[PDB]
Design brief:
This is part of a larger assembly, with one copy of chain A, two copies of chain B and three copies of chain C. By secondary structure, chain A is mainly β. Chain A has one domain. Chain A is built from two helices and eight strands, in the order H-E-H-E-E-E-E-E-E-E. In chain A, the strands form two sheets. In chain A, strands 1, 2, 5, 6 and 8 form a five-stranded antiparallel beta sheet that branches. In chain A, strands 4-3-7 form a three-stranded antiparallel beta sheet, with no helix packed on it. Chain B is elongated and about 55 Å long. By secondary structure, chain C is mainly beta. In chain C, 6% of the residues lie in helices and 31% in strands. In chain C, the strands form three sheets. In chain C, strands 1, 2, 3, 6, 10, 11 and 13 form a seven-stranded mixed beta sheet that branches. A five-stranded antiparallel beta sheet of chain C has the order 8-4-12-7-9, with no helix packed on it. Chain C is globular and about 55 Å long. Classes of the chains: A mainly beta, B little secondary structure, C mainly beta. Chains A and C meet through loops of A and loops of C. It is classed as virus.
Chain lengths: 207, 42, 213, 42, 213, 213
């Protein structure tokens, strides 16, 4: 039962890590993180085993401070859907928009948790698109800010844990053995090609 | 193991060197348990 | 002959239907397979964008959907020896060969490498399929072995594999063909030093849409 | 027209030169009209 | 393939019966047949007295009764030519070669010549079968021709031929096999100079008795 | 094998009938076909006027009527290549080769050229069939192709074709056979430089009349 796709993918791993400063002259405050599931090599190798995929996602935000102690401070997470403009500053108008859903949660509360459905104009996500427009499948954004009035003087460090749900896959393909070089390109190295089987002494042994 | 039984006979005007491809798969009885992350990647 | 039906699905309909002059055996030129050859690949829906009625009705339209009936002959004498692996690959993306991690300094394949045309293109590293993927498990795709001591023919009926039921036939190659000489060609002196490989394809169940005069 | 598709492969100890005989005839639809003396003779 | 049933009798029972691990295809090593070869013979119930479960259950017992299913492959190219004669001989007694009429001065074959083992032995005078008997009428036995332009295989199902229904499998070789190249091997230069001969035997209907631990 | 029935008529009766010793396979000697060969022809009812019982019963009689069952084997190795055209010709009149228009100065074929006998005769200009008639349309006769990569045998059942139901078997050759190497013989060095051609004929439904002792 633990060999199906729904158990091969559905497990709350760690996708991303977002920093935040909220300082003085560099009064950024916000921290946008374009969300793609190809961050860490493990999930990319498990997701490039297939050609087409379709899934919902559960997102869990676990926010700590620099040292680690957490004081009660309001935080706004904001999901910018595909096509909507990203926020530019801490207090721009793209923060008070009603289309962009927000989650208001304190630091002392349990970690935040939302769910994002299938949001592609095609019938399924495709990672290998042979042609000309990388494809145009996207999931959105997750800009986060400290809700306050007087500038907060702390630097947080959020973690974004993703779990896939209701996963369906199509057109299996072999597993990438060569190392990675870029994010959105399967570029390998021409020289120094690593063999898929470690060498042994001779062909008439069992090493 | 894979042993030479008799010989590799070959008629005239023919290369006396060939190859053998080995392939392998599981069966209907193959069952897998305990999920764990792999170690081919770094 | 034995037919390997790709993914167990027949190419079916869902737009004009020519049904007369496009369901004919388009025969590509033969490739000369030699001792030190590496392999060949063909991006399909732009192989036939320059050949006759199918090229005319695929360039002047905007939407496209069809399957294919492939046929790969490789006729050699009874004294030659070797083996080929013929396999279709859905969404066969050619990777770039380099060791650069910067965006606009890393190499990328050109237009002639990604879309070879009606003359095909050869591999550079057939051990990694020019995609960073080892070919030893490339048998996960629909495939046949052309073994030069059992048969000389292969045939693949491949349906339409795409996420959108209609797509442009010029800016998106659906799937590719890859012939690879796993076992090299061997022959005694005095024989024919090169073996021809012939490919004929039939566009089963073609559908075209949105034609711009 | 008659084109070389792929090649003419040949194993060792075999002549790599062959011939092709072309033949031709009419069909059931072939109909002929207006008699006239030929011009092969003088 | 065509099976020559020896003497028109199937090997039947009459004591333990293994029936599991001894009814398997024991495959002997291949013999390299060349131009100037002479022939080969095998004494059967002591060919398999050193190979696995049948050797264990034939050495540790005292009474023995079984038949055999033979298989002799000889795979050569379509440019080689020649002929073999494969024949079983009940009670194949190897004679000694000499010209002495005195009892303890006349020659006699050694233990390695009478019982060759799992590696066989070659003839010295194949015209007289090393027994003073001409091979031209050796077709009186069960036999097949391995002609290298018609087939490459032979099979002999041989029953139990003995005067006593039980006998020792160590001190009495029941019957022998003899392969003889009647027509020699011929080939043009550049081909494989030696042809392998493979023999697989199956001990049909084995019975063992009186086991001494 | 495939039999080409000449003109769609079986040789039938209409006089003594031997029916025993003349309906046997008369086998002519083999012709050595080489690279620079031209062709061969046989005038039939005087091929067998010197061979045994049919020759005796055809020389000592005055009236004759029979059909024929032909068989032309040409056994070559699988490395030779070429093609033969075997065709029967009713009333095959050999022309003379010259450029003279005067009656008793123009050339004429001799007795050995018109009636070759049981050893046949070779052509001089096979492009014009030695009759001023081009062989390209010689497929109008009953004929077969002996192609050395598909088959090695041909057979022609030819009936009695004559304007008078009885005629002399000595002074009138009814019809002839012509084998012509359209595609020449080719072979690599080290093979057999000449291919034998064997012809066996059977006089189906023979009838003889008016025997002069």
């Amino acid at each position: 039962l633990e060999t199906t796709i729904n158990h091969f993918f559905s497990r709350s791993g760690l996708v991303g890590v977002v920093n935040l400063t909220d300082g003085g002259t560099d009064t950024t405050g916000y921290a946008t993180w374009d969300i793609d599931i190809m961050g860490f090599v493990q999930l990319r190798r498990k997701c490039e085993m297939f050609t087409y995929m379709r899934f919902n996602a559960e997102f869990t935000f676990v926010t700590t401070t620099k040292n680690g102690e957490a004081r009660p401070y309001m935080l706004q997470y904001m999901y910018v859907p595909p096509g909507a403009p990203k926020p530019t500053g801490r207090d721009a108008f793209q923060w008070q928009t009603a289309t962009n859903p927000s989650v208001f949660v304190k630091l002392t509360d349990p970690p935040a948790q939302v769910s994002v459905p299938f949001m592609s104009p095609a019938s399924a996500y495709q990672w290998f698109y042979d042609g000309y427009p990388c494809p145009n499948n996207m999931m959105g954004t997750f800009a986060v800010r400290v809700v306050s009035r007087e500038a907060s003087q702390l630097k947080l460090q959020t973690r974004v844990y993703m779990k896939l749900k209701h996963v369906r896959a199509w057109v299996p393909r072999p597993i990438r053995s060569q190392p990675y070089l870029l994010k959105n390109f399967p570029n390998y190295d021409s020289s120094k090609i690593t063999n898929s089987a470690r060498d042994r002494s001779s062909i008439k042994q069992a090493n | 193991t894979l042993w030479y039984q008799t010989n590799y006979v070959v008629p005239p005007e023919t290369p006396g060197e060939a190859y053998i491809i080995a392939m392998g798969a599981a069966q209907d009885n193959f069952t897998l348990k305990i999920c764990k992350d792999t170690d081919e990647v770094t | 002959a034995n037919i390997v039906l790709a993914y167990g699905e027949w190419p079916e309909y869902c737009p004009t239907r020519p049904d007369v002059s496009v369901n004919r055996f388009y025969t590509l030129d033969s490739k000369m397979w030699q001792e030190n050859s590496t392999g060949w690949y063909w991006k399909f829906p732009d192989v036939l964008n320059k050949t006759g009625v199918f090229g005319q009705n695929a360039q002047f339209h905007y939407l496209y959907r069809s399957g294919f009936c492939l046929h790969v002959q490789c006729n050699a004498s009874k004294f030659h020896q070797g083996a080929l692996l013929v396999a279709v690959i859905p969404e066969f993306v050619i990777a770039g060969r380099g060791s650069n991690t910067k965006p606009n300094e890393a190499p990328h394949p050109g237009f002639t490498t990604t879309f070879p045309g009606t003359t095909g293109a050869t591999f550079h590293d057939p051990y990694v399929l020019d995609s960073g993927v080892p070919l030893s498990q490339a048998l996960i795709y629909p495939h046949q072995w052309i073994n030069l001591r059992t048969n000389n023919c292969a045939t693949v009926i491949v349906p339409y594999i795409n996420a959108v039921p209609f797509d442009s036939a010029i800016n998106h190659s659906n799937f590719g063909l890859i012939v690879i000489p796993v076992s090299p060609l061997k022959y005694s002196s005095g024989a024919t030093t090169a073996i021809p490989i012939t490919i004929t394809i039939a566009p089963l169940n073609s559908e075209f849409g949105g034609l711009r005069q």
